[PDB]
Each structure stands twice: as structure tokens, then as C-alpha cells.
Amino acid sequence: IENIGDGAEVVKRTEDTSSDKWGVTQNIQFDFVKDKKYNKDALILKMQGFINSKTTYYNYKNTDHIKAMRWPFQYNIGLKTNDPNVDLINYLPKNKIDSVNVSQTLGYNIGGNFNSFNYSKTISYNQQNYISEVEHQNSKSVQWGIKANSFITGKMSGHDPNLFVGYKPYSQNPRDYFVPDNELPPLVHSGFNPSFIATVSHEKGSGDTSEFEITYGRNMDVTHATRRTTYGNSYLEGSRIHNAFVNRNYTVKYEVNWKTHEIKVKGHN
Amino acid sequence: NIENIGDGAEVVKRTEDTSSDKWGVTQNIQFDFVKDKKYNKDALILKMQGFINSKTTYYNYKNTDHIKAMRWPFQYNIGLKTNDPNVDLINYLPKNKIDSVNVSQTLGYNIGGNFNSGGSFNYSKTISYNQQNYISEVEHQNSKSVQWGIKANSFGKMSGHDPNLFVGYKPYSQNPRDYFVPDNELPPLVHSGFNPSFIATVSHEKGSGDTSEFEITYGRNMDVTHATRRTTHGNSYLEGSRIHNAFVNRNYTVKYEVNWKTHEIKVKGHN
Amino acid sequence: NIENIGAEVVKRTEDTSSDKWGVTQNIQFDFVKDKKYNKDALILKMQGFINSKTTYYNYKNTDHIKAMRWPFQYNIGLKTNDPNVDLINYLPKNKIDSVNVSQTLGYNIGGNFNSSFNYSKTISYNQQNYISEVEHQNSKSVQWGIKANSFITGKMSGHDPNLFVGYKPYSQNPRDYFVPDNELPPLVHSGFNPSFIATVSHEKGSGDTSEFEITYGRNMDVTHATRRTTNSYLEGSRIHNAFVNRNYTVKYEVNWKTHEIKVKGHN
Amino acid sequence: NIENIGDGAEVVKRTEDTSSDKWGVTQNIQFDFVKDKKYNKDALILKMQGFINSKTTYYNYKNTDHIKAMRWPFQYNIGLKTNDPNVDLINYLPKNKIDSVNVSQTLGYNIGGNFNSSFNYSKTISYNQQNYISEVEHQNSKSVQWGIKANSFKMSGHDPNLFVGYKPYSQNPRDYFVPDNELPPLVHSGFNPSFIATVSHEKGSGDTSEFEITYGRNMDVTHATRRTTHYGNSYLEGSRIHNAFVNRNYTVKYEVNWKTHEIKVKGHN
């Protein structure tokens, strides 16, 4: 509990949920804004945690010269509620952004005014080579996509068939058919450390509970590197299956109590 | 009537005019549906006009001849609401607190579901109303509604809360009207009524249902000013006292059902 | 002209035009008077009009090459030299290509600007086919560029050599060598009606006066349409940035004490 | 020393340590120049550390034996400013009102002139302020001044009886006030500042800028007066002289060279 002014106060709550099935950890912060001078209950949701890239390398069937790399072309971050009295009033990042680092602040001033300060929260996350953009949003939900944008190798786009293709056509090790980790962005060799914010208002006295579903996941692409022999000189050529495995998402359902400020994990997949 | 607004987009127009003697309110509503093959949702621009009688009255206080009353509209209410979860409020005018004698704004629409307020627009809609001595501001709003309040603001200078506001000059008259200032000294919103001109724009997710109910409310909050005769140690004068928010939400509410496919408008009911 | 918002906003205004540059600067100076704010605040709403000055003419003494000089970009800038003044906000802040640009600046007692308020100021302008973006800004200035962006003819960028090229290769009228007005966006056939905001703070008591220079202008491109005989037709070439910074600058002096505005000069 | 933080970006480090026996304060400043071709401005991150003695003293009131005094630091002052018009203050930490016992935050930098409050370069602050509260008292494009004042001890830092002792007949003024073991470090010892401010400078506009850094205190005086309900039964009552000694500060002027990176101490008071 933090006093941020006369009559104003922020009740803070948190929840940590992880899944070995999806390779994801959801660290959610629930900051309730109790302000006598605000005609609505307000909750600031800061969504952090980790989404494993689950990048995998493997031989293609029983061949010797075709090997594969399954990697995250896009990371999914989503928040929604079905509570009729709940409205999504702001979210960060709001616009398309490609900065290696995404740092933004949300400010709050007594009287019920947010500025996307008596209280303030911030988000900070890296997306090297990737780009963030809200794919969908309305009064009940917001969905972000953080996808493969541009790579420096010349320069390559996230759709280039030869993206990530390696330099050892004769190696029998699948990992060698693709570029080494030191040449890959963190979102590919390790994963994504999301930092997002969503503020929702709730009509005072319309009901003590609201359920929010927060989804973290990824869409995987498959890059096949095939050995081509010239002069005898050999090299690897890439081909791709785009959106090979989409929406591999971890979803958690949280029920918040506006009166008591209790947080309850209703379920997850 | 249907209007071509360019680029395979059009606007279907509908209007409903409902009046209530009980409330002394006339709701003249315009329904403009925006059909844009380039906008992934249905859209409707609602323009709310009509009239709300001030219903200002004067009367004597019980069993006395030196205390008289003026019951008048301290605030006019204009509200729009819907319970359709498939509908989201896009915009509304006026959006911010505004005290100018005349409120004139424009709603513009550009292909692609682009609405803006404050020949470049594919379609436009305007609002215009007077509120001399009053001030407009949104009382409450969310994804499903918007409520405006047009209240007594400033009238030497006097605020809408000054207890001596409107106190007259005839302390010996038996006519309650003589205890308050003459009509020529009252702004139109007090001696006659209010001529609202508001707009709200909403979107509707397609294929989610062909119907939505919208509840539009027009009304007033009345204050009572009591003028009491006072006499010095021989001349007499009147002194005011107030019962603020004496009669709140004296409103006329009409429930309109809209059909997003046929663009039919039906009055489901009213109070 | 004073609005009560224990705080108030003192409103002032100036209108200055130039037949030399074909510009009218309509500036609103809203002084924020709030005891709970440790600084003087001035909200500048910059409106007016910048004539497009689009012109059509023959190229030298030929009869088959005609030209169109038009505004590739409109310039809007604000700057102050007063070291006690800081530009604290401005709208629009980010790059935007919306046909219409409308935003609001909210103010709440205590020196809280949201780029429900005690006072608000809004901006609204149309820029069909053009795009707005801040080219430079610091604590003392801010400069906007509203340039030719994308056009639906197919589609052409603001840099396409054939943009605006007409349909009448044999007409002797230079206007006919280019598309008619109905096919032209307002920023080309008429001009620009700016609506920009900038809020500046001034250190209390450090000096009763501050000078602000506001610049409205345009950068002009020239498109030459040359008749080519195949049925004949017109082909376009371009001199980009043919006439840059044709700007009208007006210097305004403000008095934080009396709220008196003075036009100290202009070009 | 010099450090590489990325392609075409490095950080030049310089330090200065100046003390004043008179003011009882030491300024340990860190000057990190950020050189990045991907950034069109000269940047400097200043980390201000050192020590400010509380200079807490105890004494008797003139010609009396029942009124004694405690002169202590109600607030510590930390400030930085410059007169160079080519310099703009871009960030400072801590930025918002904060009362946590410890204050730890980080300033992250990313190539291209990107500051965050994961990074090509990083700088952090950490200081304790038990019983006190930090807040920026004034700031603009040329300066920032922090105030670290007495907040809560249960009574406020404005309570006239704050620190009043228990020995109403002792002849030692120290005995008229609570013992050190009952006082927070910022009162009986001093303050260990840890603040950061980042400024920019338009390249080629000048090679030098003068920066004045200020460390000091605002002292309050608490007078404890013996009160006697009846012969032999007494206690001490406090009264305050708030803002008794304001701006008891040690100000040093540092001239930095944006090209050569040399730091010069032009002077101090």
C-alpha cells in the first residue's frame, strides 16, 4: 500500500505463474488505484516475465543434407476481459516501434488522469531485430505482435528464405547448418522478456470481481537449409515454412476483487 | 436518404422525433450509418437535437406572504447509453469543458474508420447550440455511454451557486413572480429552455448481431431559490436562500432499437 | 478575455499577414495563471494560412515544355532566445500521416499538462496526401515539416517525377499540362491551414519579457512536363527543392507581468 | 580510462574529488562522456556522490539553564546547473518523489542517443535516507535541484517535539534530546548522496561548459524548554525555528571540454 496524495492510494499485488509446456513465465503486477477524486476504480497491469524462444535445430527426416531450424518469427502478448463494466483506457507501447530498447512511462495524477505525477509505472524491454505493434484493440482487449523485422548479416528482412542459413554444408550437426548464436538476436537464441502495460477502469459498485486473461506465446517458422553443390564447391540454401506452428500460447485467467483487492488464479492452459 | 461519400462508401440517414408532455421534452434524433467497405466495423453517428423546456415556475411558500420561490433548471442533462457489448463509443462532441456562449464543432469522417472533431472529409456532421451563462462538460463516459451536464456557471459577476442569484425587487408584492428578476434579466436557458445539439459516434462489430438498443436521456436538475422579505431598522428588500439539487434527473428517456443491416429505426419505449 | 479555470487563463491574440510570402499568422497566446505552479506558462496555438502559391507557366520560349511550381513541404517553426524559457510540450509530437490531425492539450492545476482538465487547447488540420513530423526540437525550439507523402492517382510517392503530370500534350495552356484541381489535394491547389501547439515555461521573476520567433513557409518543387511523340503524351521530370525556405518569420515579445503582446519585427 | 560500448561508441571517464573542511562536505563526481557517431549530440552523464556532514550540534540558550537547543539538518541539498545555452538537461535520477529507505535506480543507454531510467552502457545510483524523503525541488533545461528532507519518524519532520529528550534537569544540552542510537544516520552522521543527471551539448557549438554542483543542508533548530506541572515534576517541551539556516552549501564549478575531455575545477566557495 502506497499513499500518493490525499485520498489517493495504490494497493499493489503480484502473481507469478510459469508453464513447462509452453516455456513461459508470467510475472504480473496489479496496481489498484484508489482515488476518492476519481469516479472509477482503476487497475494498472504491468505484464512482464519471459517467453522462451524454443529455437530448435534438427535433421529433416532421414536425410543427410537437409536440416531444420524452428524459430520464433513472432511473440504474442495479449490481455482481455469480458466484464461489461471494465474498459481498457490505455496501453503501452501504443504505437509501432522498432527501437532496440522500448522504454516508456505511464503517469497518474490525482483526480483520475493518466498520461500515457503522483504515481508512475514504466515498461522496458529489448527487441533487437524485431518490431512491436498492436495487432488488435478495443474496450475489452489489446493484442501485440513482436515479429522478425530486419537483420544485419548485407541486410535481411524477417521473410528472407535465407535468413539465418549457415556456413558448413558438410557438417552432420543440424546446428551447423545455421549461423552461430553470436550472430543471432536474443529473441532468437534465448527468448523474449516482455514489459507491457494496460490500464483498465471499472465502474464503481457495479461488481466486486473482474476476470482478465493474459496470453503469452509465439508463432514459429521453420527454415530448411539444403546442401547445394556447384565446381564441387558446396553451400547451404534456405527455404521456409512460414507460420509453421502459430499461436503456441500460454494463457492465464486472473480474477481481481476491486473491494478486497484479492487476486485469484482461476485457471490456465 | 442515402448519400455517396466516395470510394465505395455511403451514409444511410434516419431520423426519429419523439416528444413528452409530462417531461416537456422533444428528442429530435438523427441516425447516420457509415457504410465503408474499407472499415472493418459498422458505424453510426448520432446527432442529438430537440428541446428541453426550462419548466421554471414560481410559487408561494406554505402559509406565508413574505417567502416566495423560484424553481429553475440549474443543470440540463443529455446522455446516451447502450448495453450492446458489440458496440464501442468512438467519439462525442463537445469532448472538453467549454463555456463559450455558442458551442459549434464539427465531426469529420475519412475513409477507413477515421473520425475527427474540433472539403478534406468524406463526410461531416456539425453541432451548434447556445448556453449563455452556462457551461458544458462530460459528467461521465465509458465505452458504452456519455453523459453531458450543462450547468449554471457565471452571470456584478455572480456564480451559479450564489444564493442571491435571480432574487427580485418587489418585496411587498403578493405575486411569487415579483420576488425574482424579470425575464429580460434571465438567460434563455432559464426563462425558456435548452436547444441541445450533441453528437456521439459508435462502432459495431459486424456479424455479431443485427440489432442494438440505445437509450437517450434529456432532462434537468432543478434548484429552488427562496426569496425572503427583510426589513431594516423601514425599507424592505429580498434575500435569497437555496435548496441546491432540489429535483435531480427530471429526465425523459427514450430507448431506440437500431438494425445495422436494414438500417431500420424503432422506438422500443420511453418514460 | 479571462477564463476562470483558483487559477485562470489570460487570453491574447495577434494576426499578421504578408503579401510578400503569402502567409497569415494567427497566434493565440494563453497565459496560465496558477499559484500552485512554480513557473509562468504560455500556451501558443499557432494557426493561420500558408498560400500554396502553386504556379503554372511555359518553359523558356518552347511550346512543348511547361512547368508547375508547387509546395513540396510546408514549414512551421517556433523558437525563443530567452534563456529563462523552456519549451515543455508541443503538438503534434509524433510523425503522423492521417488526412486529419486533431489532438488536445489538457492542463490541470499544479503545472500538469497532458499532451477531465481545468483548461484545454486543441489543434485540428487537414493534410491530405501529406505527412507531418518534427524535424528538430530542443528546450528552445521546435520545427515541423508537412511534406508531400503519398498520392492516389495508381499511387505515387511525393518524389515520383510524373506526379501531377497532365493529359493534354498539345494544349498551349501550361495549366493543361498538369492534372486539374479536382484531382489535386488542398495543400497544392490552395494552401495549408496550420494548427499547432507549443507550451513554454518561464522562470518566475527572471525577466518580464521574452521574444518568440514564429516561422511559416514552404519549400517549392518544380515539375516540368515535356511532350513526347510516340499518340503523343506528357512526361515529367523534377527539380526537387527548387526554392527552399521561402519563409515568413514574425518576432513576438510577451510580457509575463502585463500579458501584453508586441510584434517587434518580421521579414 | 576509456571503454567500448558498441560499434562506433565509447565512453570517456573522468573524476574529481574536492572537499571543504568549512562546509563539512566532500564532492566525489564521476564524469562520463558518451561518444556515439549514431548520436548527433555530445552527451555527459554526471554521477554525484560524496558526503555531507549533518553538522548536528547541541548548545545552551543564552543566560538560562532550562532551554537548550539542537541544530540539525532538516534537509540535504543536491543541485547541478549550467549556464551554457548549448546544453540541455535530458534526464536525472531519482526523478519522482520517493521515500523508500534505500533509493536504487539505473540509467541505461542504447546506441543512437537512447536513455532509459540490455544497454550499451549503464550507470546506477544507491543511497539510504532513513526517515527522509527525496524530491526534485526545481528543474528546467539547465538544472536540477533535489531536496532530501525529514519526513516521518510516530511524528512528521515538522513535529515541534521531534527529537526532544528526557532529562529536564541535566546541564548538558545534549541530554535535552534523544541519544544518537535513537537518531537516524542522516541526523547524527550525515548524508551519502548518489544522484545522476544527463546533459547533452550541440557539437561544434563550443568546446567547454561550466557546471556548478551544490552539496549542502538547510538546518532547523529545536529548542527544548523545561515544563513543570508541580515542584519536582518536569518534562521537556519542544518548539522549532524551521529553516533557521538555509542553503549552507558547498558549491564547486567544473569546466569540461567536450573535445579533449579534460575537467578543470575553476573554483569553489
PDB file of N, CA and C in Angstrom, chain B residues 20-72:
ATOM      1  N   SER B  20     -42.513  14.486 -25.220  1.00  0.00           N
ATOM      2  CA  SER B  20     -43.194  14.102 -23.991  1.00  0.00           C
ATOM      3  C   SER B  20     -43.778  15.309 -23.274  1.00  0.00           C
ATOM      4  N   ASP B  21     -45.102  15.356 -23.146  1.00  0.00           N
ATOM      5  CA  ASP B  21     -45.732  16.469 -22.446  1.00  0.00           C
ATOM      6  C   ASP B  21     -45.380  16.406 -20.968  1.00  0.00           C
ATOM      7  N   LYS B  22     -45.416  15.207 -20.402  1.00  0.00           N
ATOM      8  CA  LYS B  22     -45.079  15.040 -18.998  1.00  0.00           C
ATOM      9  C   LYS B  22     -43.748  15.721 -18.658  1.00  0.00           C
ATOM     10  N   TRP B  23     -42.705  15.409 -19.417  1.00  0.00           N
ATOM     11  CA  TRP B  23     -41.389  15.979 -19.149  1.00  0.00           C
ATOM     12  C   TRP B  23     -41.085  17.315 -19.825  1.00  0.00           C
ATOM     13  N   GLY B  24     -41.889  17.681 -20.817  1.00  0.00           N
ATOM     14  CA  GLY B  24     -41.664  18.928 -21.522  1.00  0.00           C
ATOM     15  C   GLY B  24     -40.371  18.804 -22.306  1.00  0.00           C
ATOM     16  N   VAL B  25     -40.229  17.681 -23.002  1.00  0.00           N
ATOM     17  CA  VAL B  25     -39.029  17.393 -23.772  1.00  0.00           C
ATOM     18  C   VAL B  25     -39.324  16.850 -25.162  1.00  0.00           C
ATOM     19  N   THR B  26     -38.559  17.331 -26.137  1.00  0.00           N
ATOM     20  CA  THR B  26     -38.674  16.861 -27.507  1.00  0.00           C
ATOM     21  C   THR B  26     -37.295  16.371 -27.929  1.00  0.00           C
ATOM     22  N   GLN B  27     -37.217  15.091 -28.286  1.00  0.00           N
ATOM     23  CA  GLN B  27     -35.976  14.478 -28.736  1.00  0.00           C
ATOM     24  C   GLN B  27     -35.996  14.337 -30.251  1.00  0.00           C
ATOM     25  N   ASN B  28     -35.199  15.151 -30.934  1.00  0.00           N
ATOM     26  CA  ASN B  28     -35.103  15.095 -32.390  1.00  0.00           C
ATOM     27  C   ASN B  28     -33.753  14.455 -32.685  1.00  0.00           C
ATOM     28  N   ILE B  29     -33.769  13.147 -32.925  1.00  0.00           N
ATOM     29  CA  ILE B  29     -32.543  12.398 -33.165  1.00  0.00           C
ATOM     30  C   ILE B  29     -32.265  12.025 -34.617  1.00  0.00           C
ATOM     31  N   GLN B  30     -31.027  12.252 -35.043  1.00  0.00           N
ATOM     32  CA  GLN B  30     -30.591  11.907 -36.390  1.00  0.00           C
ATOM     33  C   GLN B  30     -29.653  10.709 -36.298  1.00  0.00           C
ATOM     34  N   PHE B  31     -29.917   9.700 -37.122  1.00  0.00           N
ATOM     35  CA  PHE B  31     -29.131   8.465 -37.153  1.00  0.00           C
ATOM     36  C   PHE B  31     -28.401   8.327 -38.485  1.00  0.00           C
ATOM     37  N   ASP B  32     -27.086   8.527 -38.479  1.00  0.00           N
ATOM     38  CA  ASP B  32     -26.312   8.399 -39.710  1.00  0.00           C
ATOM     39  C   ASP B  32     -25.386   7.191 -39.644  1.00  0.00           C
ATOM     40  N   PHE B  33     -25.698   6.186 -40.459  1.00  0.00           N
ATOM     41  CA  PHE B  33     -24.913   4.962 -40.520  1.00  0.00           C
ATOM     42  C   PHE B  33     -23.820   5.122 -41.562  1.00  0.00           C
ATOM     43  N   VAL B  34     -22.583   4.840 -41.168  1.00  0.00           N
ATOM     44  CA  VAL B  34     -21.454   4.957 -42.081  1.00  0.00           C
ATOM     45  C   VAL B  34     -21.077   3.580 -42.610  1.00  0.00           C
ATOM     46  N   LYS B  35     -21.342   3.352 -43.892  1.00  0.00           N
ATOM     47  CA  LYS B  35     -21.026   2.076 -44.528  1.00  0.00           C
ATOM     48  C   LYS B  35     -19.759   2.259 -45.347  1.00  0.00           C
ATOM     49  N   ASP B  36     -18.668   1.680 -44.863  1.00  0.00           N
ATOM     50  CA  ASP B  36     -17.386   1.785 -45.538  1.00  0.00           C
ATOM     51  C   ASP B  36     -16.784   0.394 -45.704  1.00  0.00           C
ATOM     52  N   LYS B  37     -16.698  -0.059 -46.950  1.00  0.00           N
ATOM     53  CA  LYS B  37     -16.136  -1.372 -47.252  1.00  0.00           C
ATOM     54  C   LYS B  37     -14.661  -1.431 -46.850  1.00  0.00           C
ATOM     55  N   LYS B  38     -14.103  -0.285 -46.466  1.00  0.00           N
ATOM     56  CA  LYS B  38     -12.706  -0.221 -46.059  1.00  0.00           C
ATOM     57  C   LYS B  38     -12.552  -0.087 -44.547  1.00  0.00           C
ATOM     58  N   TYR B  39     -13.682  -0.099 -43.844  1.00  0.00           N
ATOM     59  CA  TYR B  39     -13.698  -0.019 -42.384  1.00  0.00           C
ATOM     60  C   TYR B  39     -14.256  -1.354 -41.885  1.00  0.00           C
ATOM     61  N   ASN B  40     -13.439  -2.080 -41.129  1.00  0.00           N
ATOM     62  CA  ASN B  40     -13.799  -3.396 -40.604  1.00  0.00           C
ATOM     63  C   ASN B  40     -14.935  -3.436 -39.579  1.00  0.00           C
ATOM     64  N   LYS B  41     -15.692  -2.349 -39.455  1.00  0.00           N
ATOM     65  CA  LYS B  41     -16.799  -2.300 -38.493  1.00  0.00           C
ATOM     66  C   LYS B  41     -17.941  -1.422 -38.971  1.00  0.00           C
ATOM     67  N   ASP B  42     -19.103  -1.597 -38.351  1.00  0.00           N
ATOM     68  CA  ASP B  42     -20.265  -0.783 -38.671  1.00  0.00           C
ATOM     69  C   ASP B  42     -20.067   0.471 -37.842  1.00  0.00           C
ATOM     70  N   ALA B  43     -20.644   1.576 -38.286  1.00  0.00           N
ATOM     71  CA  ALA B  43     -20.509   2.813 -37.543  1.00  0.00           C
ATOM     72  C   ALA B  43     -21.793   3.613 -37.648  1.00  0.00           C
ATOM     73  N   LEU B  44     -22.076   4.352 -36.584  1.00  0.00           N
ATOM     74  CA  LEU B  44     -23.263   5.177 -36.510  1.00  0.00           C
ATOM     75  C   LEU B  44     -22.955   6.506 -35.820  1.00  0.00           C
ATOM     76  N   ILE B  45     -23.323   7.598 -36.480  1.00  0.00           N
ATOM     77  CA  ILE B  45     -23.145   8.936 -35.935  1.00  0.00           C
ATOM     78  C   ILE B  45     -24.524   9.377 -35.435  1.00  0.00           C
ATOM     79  N   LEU B  46     -24.634   9.652 -34.140  1.00  0.00           N
ATOM     80  CA  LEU B  46     -25.908  10.092 -33.577  1.00  0.00           C
ATOM     81  C   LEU B  46     -25.848  11.580 -33.283  1.00  0.00           C
ATOM     82  N   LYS B  47     -26.784  12.331 -33.850  1.00  0.00           N
ATOM     83  CA  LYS B  47     -26.831  13.756 -33.579  1.00  0.00           C
ATOM     84  C   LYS B  47     -28.091  13.980 -32.759  1.00  0.00           C
ATOM     85  N   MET B  48     -27.895  14.481 -31.547  1.00  0.00           N
ATOM     86  CA  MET B  48     -28.990  14.715 -30.623  1.00  0.00           C
ATOM     87  C   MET B  48     -29.406  16.169 -30.516  1.00  0.00           C
ATOM     88  N   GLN B  49     -30.590  16.457 -31.047  1.00  0.00           N
ATOM     89  CA  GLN B  49     -31.146  17.798 -31.012  1.00  0.00           C
ATOM     90  C   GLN B  49     -32.536  17.732 -30.395  1.00  0.00           C
ATOM     91  N   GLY B  50     -33.254  18.843 -30.451  1.00  0.00           N
ATOM     92  CA  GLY B  50     -34.580  18.870 -29.869  1.00  0.00           C
ATOM     93  C   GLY B  50     -34.714  20.040 -28.924  1.00  0.00           C
ATOM     94  N   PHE B  51     -35.476  19.858 -27.853  1.00  0.00           N
ATOM     95  CA  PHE B  51     -35.698  20.944 -26.918  1.00  0.00           C
ATOM     96  C   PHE B  51     -36.065  20.447 -25.533  1.00  0.00           C
ATOM     97  N   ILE B  52     -35.581  21.145 -24.515  1.00  0.00           N
ATOM     98  CA  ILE B  52     -35.912  20.805 -23.145  1.00  0.00           C
ATOM     99  C   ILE B  52     -36.444  22.093 -22.526  1.00  0.00           C
ATOM    100  N   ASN B  53     -37.727  22.101 -22.189  1.00  0.00           N
ATOM    101  CA  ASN B  53     -38.337  23.270 -21.584  1.00  0.00           C
ATOM    102  C   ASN B  53     -37.709  23.491 -20.219  1.00  0.00           C
ATOM    103  N   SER B  54     -37.509  24.752 -19.860  1.00  0.00           N
ATOM    104  CA  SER B  54     -36.916  25.075 -18.574  1.00  0.00           C
ATOM    105  C   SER B  54     -37.829  24.649 -17.429  1.00  0.00           C
ATOM    106  N   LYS B  55     -39.140  24.699 -17.658  1.00  0.00           N
ATOM    107  CA  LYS B  55     -40.122  24.341 -16.638  1.00  0.00           C
ATOM    108  C   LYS B  55     -39.953  25.205 -15.383  1.00  0.00           C
ATOM    109  N   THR B  56     -39.359  26.379 -15.560  1.00  0.00           N
ATOM    110  CA  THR B  56     -39.154  27.294 -14.447  1.00  0.00           C
ATOM    111  C   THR B  56     -40.515  27.737 -13.900  1.00  0.00           C
ATOM    112  N   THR B  57     -40.734  27.592 -12.597  1.00  0.00           N
ATOM    113  CA  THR B  57     -42.008  28.015 -12.023  1.00  0.00           C
ATOM    114  C   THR B  57     -41.802  28.847 -10.763  1.00  0.00           C
ATOM    115  N   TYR B  58     -42.820  29.634 -10.408  1.00  0.00           N
ATOM    116  CA  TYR B  58     -42.783  30.490  -9.226  1.00  0.00           C
ATOM    117  C   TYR B  58     -44.019  30.207  -8.369  1.00  0.00           C
ATOM    118  N   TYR B  59     -43.848  30.186  -7.053  1.00  0.00           N
ATOM    119  CA  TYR B  59     -44.962  29.882  -6.171  1.00  0.00           C
ATOM    120  C   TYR B  59     -44.708  30.399  -4.764  1.00  0.00           C
ATOM    121  N   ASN B  60     -45.768  30.484  -3.964  1.00  0.00           N
ATOM    122  CA  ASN B  60     -45.635  30.955  -2.594  1.00  0.00           C
ATOM    123  C   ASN B  60     -45.223  29.827  -1.676  1.00  0.00           C
ATOM    124  N   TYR B  61     -44.499  30.179  -0.623  1.00  0.00           N
ATOM    125  CA  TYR B  61     -44.086  29.208   0.368  1.00  0.00           C
ATOM    126  C   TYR B  61     -45.342  28.980   1.211  1.00  0.00           C
ATOM    127  N   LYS B  62     -45.494  27.775   1.747  1.00  0.00           N
ATOM    128  CA  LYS B  62     -46.658  27.435   2.568  1.00  0.00           C
ATOM    129  C   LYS B  62     -46.984  28.434   3.695  1.00  0.00           C
ATOM    130  N   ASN B  63     -48.271  28.764   3.825  1.00  0.00           N
ATOM    131  CA  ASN B  63     -48.803  29.658   4.862  1.00  0.00           C
ATOM    132  C   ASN B  63     -48.045  30.939   5.206  1.00  0.00           C
ATOM    133  N   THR B  64     -47.505  31.612   4.205  1.00  0.00           N
ATOM    134  CA  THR B  64     -46.787  32.848   4.463  1.00  0.00           C
ATOM    135  C   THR B  64     -46.910  33.755   3.257  1.00  0.00           C
ATOM    136  N   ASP B  65     -46.715  35.051   3.464  1.00  0.00           N
ATOM    137  CA  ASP B  65     -46.809  36.002   2.365  1.00  0.00           C
ATOM    138  C   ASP B  65     -45.462  36.649   2.047  1.00  0.00           C
ATOM    139  N   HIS B  66     -44.471  36.456   2.921  1.00  0.00           N
ATOM    140  CA  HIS B  66     -43.159  37.069   2.718  1.00  0.00           C
ATOM    141  C   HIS B  66     -42.010  36.143   2.302  1.00  0.00           C
ATOM    142  N   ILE B  67     -42.331  34.919   1.891  1.00  0.00           N
ATOM    143  CA  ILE B  67     -41.316  33.975   1.409  1.00  0.00           C
ATOM    144  C   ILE B  67     -41.905  33.367   0.147  1.00  0.00           C
ATOM    145  N   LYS B  68     -41.234  33.576  -0.981  1.00  0.00           N
ATOM    146  CA  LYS B  68     -41.718  33.036  -2.239  1.00  0.00           C
ATOM    147  C   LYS B  68     -40.609  32.252  -2.935  1.00  0.00           C
ATOM    148  N   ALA B  69     -40.984  31.387  -3.876  1.00  0.00           N
ATOM    149  CA  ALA B  69     -39.995  30.534  -4.527  1.00  0.00           C
ATOM    150  C   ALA B  69     -39.942  30.510  -6.041  1.00  0.00           C
ATOM    151  N   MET B  70     -38.740  30.235  -6.537  1.00  0.00           N
ATOM    152  CA  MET B  70     -38.469  30.112  -7.962  1.00  0.00           C
ATOM    153  C   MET B  70     -37.769  28.767  -8.111  1.00  0.00           C
ATOM    154  N   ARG B  71     -38.393  27.858  -8.854  1.00  0.00           N
ATOM    155  CA  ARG B  71     -37.837  26.528  -9.121  1.00  0.00           C
ATOM    156  C   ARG B  71     -37.330  26.626 -10.550  1.00  0.00           C
ATOM    157  N   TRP B  72     -36.021  26.473 -10.737  1.00  0.00           N
ATOM    158  CA  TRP B  72     -35.423  26.622 -12.055  1.00  0.00           C
ATOM    159  C   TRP B  72     -34.349  25.572 -12.379  1.00  0.00           C
TER     160      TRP B  72
END
